[PDB]
Amino acid sequence: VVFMNASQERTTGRQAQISNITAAKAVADVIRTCLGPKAMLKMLLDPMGGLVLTNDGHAILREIDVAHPAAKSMLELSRTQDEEVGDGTTTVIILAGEILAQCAPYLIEKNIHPVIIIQALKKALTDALEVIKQVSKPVDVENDAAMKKLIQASIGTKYVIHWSEKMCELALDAVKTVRKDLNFEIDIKRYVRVEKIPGGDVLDSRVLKGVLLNKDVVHPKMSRHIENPRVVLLDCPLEYKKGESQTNIEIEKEEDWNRILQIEEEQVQLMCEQILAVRPTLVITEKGVSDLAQHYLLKGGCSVLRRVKKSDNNRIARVTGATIVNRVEDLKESDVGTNCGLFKVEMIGDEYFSFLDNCGLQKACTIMLRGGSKDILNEIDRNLQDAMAVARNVMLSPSLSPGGGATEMAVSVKLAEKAKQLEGIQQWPYQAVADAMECIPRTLIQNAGGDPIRLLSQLRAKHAQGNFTTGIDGDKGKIVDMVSYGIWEPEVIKQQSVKTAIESACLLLRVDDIVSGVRK
């Protein structure tokens, strides 16, 4: 006579909120030192055994299973921030924790209702987007020299700041290739390929506009160096396709069995003759290839590569402009790809690699990263994802804002001036939003090794004079303006941070009871 198979007992009242807010503080503590240029690294032991060395916020949270359900709302914010932008994931977690940490002693102390706080955060969020729009400014998007320092901003936290001169050119040429004209920048990360090659040196690299395949030719007579290749994409297998009808043959005469295998040879003969109707030089197929079909293609020099993935065939199509056609009858000269060149197979003892290069504005490329271990290849690969993620927003919108705690301090100073001017019941939680933006500058200072009490005290008086571009240096900890150094980020990262931080606080502040035992 329990009346409930799912937590007949209840944890209600204020104790559930202590468990919620304290859990929201704990997820921020394990990544508090993961901000700024002097940030440390972390290691995670997954149960499968694949280790990873990460400092980005999204990779930390997704590989950590958490038993607390209220904490999991904080775990998913970096997932939301990752798929939306792909940069600034760590700031969303600590900012959401400071909002929840600062709003903690109001239900305990003041006994102010949560729904009044919900109204306070929306007006603060409305004013937060207003002052961020005032602090932001436009810049020229076509200046390649200007784009290098903006990509260098997010790279400065990561390990590859030492190769920032190479990484900016590596990412700037790649994002411009997939870019096209038509939200005015409809290019997508899915078209950009990044193949991880263990070994080599990271200094030696280049942006090759092509599709890097990880297999060898099927027959040894084929020439591995073609001057003017002609790409033709196919979905049909060169093998004999088995019918799904399960056809059985009643053989009575003696010549029927010999004629069937001759029709098998005649079908592959007629099928290969239609490939040579447009005389290609390079053929690609996503299915198997019989040994019978290899001989007939030697006379034409049609290099074949088999078991190619479905996504790689689409990437081959956009580079060379070839159309994917299943049947072999519909091959035309327009179907054959053109404007391709520099087909060469470099011999490496691990695996065989084949390059491609060009001479329907959609394009693609393959960034070949060289390193020392597979785990740091994932680090540099994730930095490439962060390298192009910061570049999309400056190309999408020309708007741009400073960073390094200066833009967050400008929100706190403007809110603090109007917080005393409001003079109402909602002004108490309205002040918590102004105090919540101080964690980021503080975090940066603390990691740098400075004394945050006096560095931030003069920073308050500095911003009171009427300037906004004054930040905090990460190495030595000056109050120097960021115009000299060049720390600048897009506006979309800070907009998504304050929006996701406010929207996450509204989700978690309106919880009073915790239950379990449902087993859906």
Binding site: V2, R10, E84, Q119, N314, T323, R327, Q496, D513
Partner: protein
């Protein structure tokens, strides 16, 4: 309660036997045990809850419809309130939290009447005469839907359904969204009767900017991915034709139990060709019709994708049945299960194709959605909700889905009444004077029925963490003068309720909160029919499983 009773003393039953007022008390505690989780979720001051499935997965929910459905209760007296929450979600779509609290208090307040040796048959009769007297009073106190020169109604109706949600602060922005959505997806049936199909609009689980910047689509949005990446994503120009197919387009075998058998091996390749050719003849005539966009319920094989990529046709696989009826209804096309006609020949006519102005595929946080806008024959609408994660959007999805049902009822029935416990407090003053007229034992039943109705405005103040008796006493004072209004408007002291954000009694018409009267009607009958089901039980017979 105290101890367990004797197990089948000279009765010889395999299960348990219990009788008397003990099980009647257990039903009261059973209805109160399941109602306590619904107490804190009532009104705008209520807070949400989360249910953990012991697998890491959790879901945030405010309404008691799906909360009690997820809470697996084994006591059968509590199952009726579980089904009552599911019943009220189907017909009305709002007030699932209120019927559980009202039904529990009617049983709780009637528990005192049981030990007074008042029979339950007399108690429910006193409740039922109070019910039909309350329905007529609700039919008298209802107001018209004009109220001014302009409409000024549907924006206020959304605030009542949108209250007590995570996006209640953003209800000012979403109020214009829901009224513009349901006015676009209207239809015509029964020779002049207008209907509003709930769930016809597409609620997408998007992630990004915020709930405030949620863009209302002027048209339907299909949630599906493109087949191939080499296809054109954006199709401009007016009069874009929409083809809605459902037949099997991938290469399939012969009839369900036949066997292909042939003696001559010369025609073995020809039968293979025509099986590959007969499926392409269907794609050939669609290109002759010139359909820019084609949608299919079943899959799409690569043999068909080459023709769409060449002719620049947008082929989309993995559509669902319920969606394509709304695409054909909105774009003006007709659902095509197979290509045939009354004649023996097989062909395709251009009349089967729809029309729309623009079709664009958009991607936002790993969510590809085909935005179809500008339907010529009939309009459509979709709402792209944006938030933190999928589990937070489930509360927003239920918040929007309940909002459509409330705005559906105020248009189907223009009669409305104010919120804030106005009618719940007005019926008490009406029933107290009626309780004295009837005389005999039903006075206590009608009186305690009226006392149970006050729990709705009381719970608004208890959850607000404020003084409740002062607000109830002031609400009692104004409603007490309404019956003694002395007509000759100057009929004041009516249509008032609680204002929780400020803690005062003001006019609900000016505050901008209303609710349809039909929700009050069905909630009272369904709450009393559930109360009749629990009161009439005397003894339980629980048989153990074999």
């Amino acid at each position: 309660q105290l101890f367990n009773n004797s197990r089948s003393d000279t009765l010889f039953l395999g299960g348990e036997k219990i009788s008397g007022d003990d099980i009647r008390n257990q039903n009261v505690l059973a209805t109160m045990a399941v109602a306590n989780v619904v107490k804190s979720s009532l009104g705008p001051v209520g807070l949400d809850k989360m249910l953990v499935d012991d697998i890491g997965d959790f879901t945030v929910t405010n309404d008691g419809a799906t909360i009690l459905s997820l809470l697996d209760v084994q006591h059968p007296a509590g199952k009726i309130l579980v089904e009552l929450a599911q019943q009220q979600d189907r017909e009305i779509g709002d007030g699932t939290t209120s019927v559980v609290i009202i039904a529990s208090e009617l049983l709780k307040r009637a528990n005192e009447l049981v030990k007074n040796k008042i029979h339950p048959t007399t108690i429910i009769t006193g409740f039922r005469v109070a019910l039909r007297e309350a329905i007529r009073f609700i039919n008298e106190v209802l107001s018209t839907s004009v109220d001014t020169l302009g409409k000024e109604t549907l924006i206020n109706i959304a605030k009542t359904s949108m209250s007590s949600k995570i996006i209640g602060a953003d209800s000012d922005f979403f109020s214009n969204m829901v009224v513009d959505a349901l006015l676009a997806v209207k239809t015509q049936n029964s020779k002049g009767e207008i209907k509003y199909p709930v769930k016809a609009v597409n609620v997408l689980k998007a992630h990004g900017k915020s709930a405030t910047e949620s863009l209302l689509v002027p048209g339907y949005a299909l949630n599906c991915t493109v087949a191939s990446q080499a296809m054109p994503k954006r199709i401009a120009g007016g009069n874009v034709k929409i083809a809605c197919l459902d037949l099997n387009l991938q290469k399939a075998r012969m009839a369900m139990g036949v066997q292909i058998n042939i003696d001559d091996p010369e025609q073995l390749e020809q039968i293979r060709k025509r099986e590959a050719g007969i499926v392409l003849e269907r794609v050939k005539k669609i290109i002759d019709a010139g359909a820019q966009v084609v949608l299919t319920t079943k899959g799409i094989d690569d043999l068909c994708l080459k023709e769409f990529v060449e002719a620049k046709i947008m082929g989309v696989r993995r559509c669902k049945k319920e969606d394509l009826r709304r695409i054909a209804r909105a774009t003006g096309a007709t659902l095509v299960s197979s290509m045939s006609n009354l004649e023996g020949e097989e062909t395709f006519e251009s009349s089967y194709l729809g029309l729309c102005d623009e079709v664009v595929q958009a991607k936002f946080s790993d969510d590809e959605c085909i935005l179809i806008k500008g339907t010529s024959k009939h309009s459509s609408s979709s709402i792209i909700l944006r938030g933190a994660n999928d589990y937070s959007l489930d509360e927003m999805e239920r918040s929007l889905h309940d909002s459509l049902s409330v705005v559906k009822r105020t248009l189907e029935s223009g009669n409305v009444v104010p919120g804030g416990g106005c009618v719940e407090a007005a019926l008490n003053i009406y029933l107290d004077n009626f309780a004295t007229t009837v005389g005999s034992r039903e006075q206590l039943a009608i009186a305690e029925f009226a006392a149970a109705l006050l729990i709705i405005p009381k719970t608004l103040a208890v959850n607000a963490a404020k003084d409740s008796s002062e607000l109830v006493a002031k609400l009692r004072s104004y409603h007490a003068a309404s019956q003694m209004a002395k007509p000759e408007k100057r009929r004041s002291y009516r249509n008032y309720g609680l204002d929780l954000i400020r803690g005062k009694i003001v006019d609900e018409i000016h505050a901008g909160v209303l609710e349809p009267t039909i929700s009050k009607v069905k909630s009272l009958k369904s709450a009393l029919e559930a109360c009749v089901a629990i009161l009439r039980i005397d003894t339980m017979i629980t048989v153990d499983p074999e």
